[PDB]
Design a protein around this ligand. Structure first.
Ligand SMILES: Cc1cc2nc3c(=O)[nH]c(=O)nc-3n(C[C@H](O)[C@H](O)[C@H](O)COP(=O)(O)OP(=O)(O)OC[C@H]3O[C@@H](n4cnc5c(N)ncnc54)[C@H](O)[C@@H]3O)c2cc1C
Ligand SMILES: C=C(O[C@H]1[C@H](O)[C@@H](CO)O[C@H](OP(=O)(O)OP(=O)(O)OC[C@H]2O[C@@H](n3ccc(=O)[nH]c3=O)[C@H](O)[C@@H]2O)[C@@H]1NC(C)=O)C(=O)O
Length: 266
């Protein structure tokens, strides 16, 4: 008896764009088994997604209920918000998540995208990962999941359902000091409607800095704009269409051989 309803994904992504989808809110292991009986996608916090104006035809699964419960010293549900865990770890005097401050991910999305900063990446903070695939749950170590930059290699159709974190006791004031350095490093970034960095960095470089140097900050298509604050942030000024965002992406790609970090749906 899980909740299934048609929604507009613009309401479920940090960028605030996206057409219609059938949303399945899964609260239990058995409900997950049912929801995955037909073609599906998994939605986390929608912070790395560019959803097109037509939306998607597959069941869109969100993990709630038991998947939002957590114990820092035990299992942590994949539907739990990473920003919550970052603060909870500091409160508990547990170190290991400080380098993940400022990433508005669900745990599952952070695993899929190996979310990280120069200070640490999600793969570093994992001891074990429960993954649902082929109708069953299995437990993996992070070394089995093919992690790289902004990358994982989960089993096909794999849904991350729960993790065990790799944390270490540290004085609370020291954890907070490490977090303050991450905050300082992120000062140049906007906190508006965005899906973070649109483009991946070429290995030697910052895509943001390259966009900046090419003078592309401030360029606009409808309500989609290359941020004046950070060149790699495309922001939604109100009612941008995905069409407008895509057009802006193509405008950048005409000038610079950059690849998207965003996942595009469909
Ligand atoms: C302001 C802002 C700042 C950001 N800063 C950073 C940063 O510093 N570093 C960084 O790496 N990223 C950053 N991001 C990008 C983004 O937060 C990450 O890619 C993050 O890991 C996405 O997680 P999510 O839960 O929002 O996933 P979503 O956007 O919902 O989904 C992304 C992908 O993960 C999949 N997915 C989601 N949940 C699961 C699951 N349970 N099991 C299997 N697959 C799943 C989706 O199907 C999709 O393929 C930022 C984004 C914003 C908006
Ligand atoms: C925000 C994301 O990740 C971010 C992550 O938060 C930060 C912190 O480690 O470093 C990466 O950005 P980045 O390479 O642009 O790092 P920043 O520190 O923001 O910028 C690097 C340098 O470029 C300069 N800067 C940045 C933007 C700009 O328009 N102009 C410019 O001159 C900054 O002043 C800084 O000296 C990540 N992007 C990738 C692809 O790795 C995301 O993935 O969505």
């Amino acid at each position: 008896f899980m909740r299934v309803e048609r929604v507009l994904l613009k309401d479920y992504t940090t960028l605030g764009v996206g057409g219609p989808a059938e949303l399945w809110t899964v609260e239990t292991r058995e409900e997950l088994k049912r929801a995955t009986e037909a073609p599906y996608r998994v939605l986390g916090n929608g912070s790395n997604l560019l959803v097109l104006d037509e939306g998607v035809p597959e069941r869109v699964i969100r993990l709630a209920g038991e998947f939002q419960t957590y114990d820092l010293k035990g299992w942590v549900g994949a539907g739990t918000l990473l920003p919550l865990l970052v603060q909870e770890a500091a409160r508990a005097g547990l170190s290991g998540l400080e380098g993940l401050l400022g990433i508005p991910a669900q745990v599952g999305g952070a695993v899929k995208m190996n979310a990280g900063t120069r200070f640490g990446e999600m793969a570093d903070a994992l001891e074990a990962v429960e993954v649902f695939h082929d109708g069953a749950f299995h437990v993996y170590c992070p070394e089995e999941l093919g992690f790289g930059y902004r990358k994982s290699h989960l089993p096909p159709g794999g849904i991350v359902t729960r993790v065990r974190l790799k944390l270490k006791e540290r004085p609370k004031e020291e954890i907070l000091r490490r977090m303050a350095e991450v905050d300082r490093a992120r000062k140049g970034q906007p906190k508006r409607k965005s899906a973070g960095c649109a483009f991946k960095n070429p290995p030697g470089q910052s895509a943001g800095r390259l966009i900046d140097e090419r003078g592309l900050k401030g360029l606009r298509v409808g309500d989609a704009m290359i941020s004046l604050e950070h060149g790699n942030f495309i922001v939604n000024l109100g009612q941008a269409r995905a069409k407008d965002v895509l057009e802006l992406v193509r405008r950048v790609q005409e000038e610079l051989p950059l690849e998207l970090e965003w996942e595009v749906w469909p």
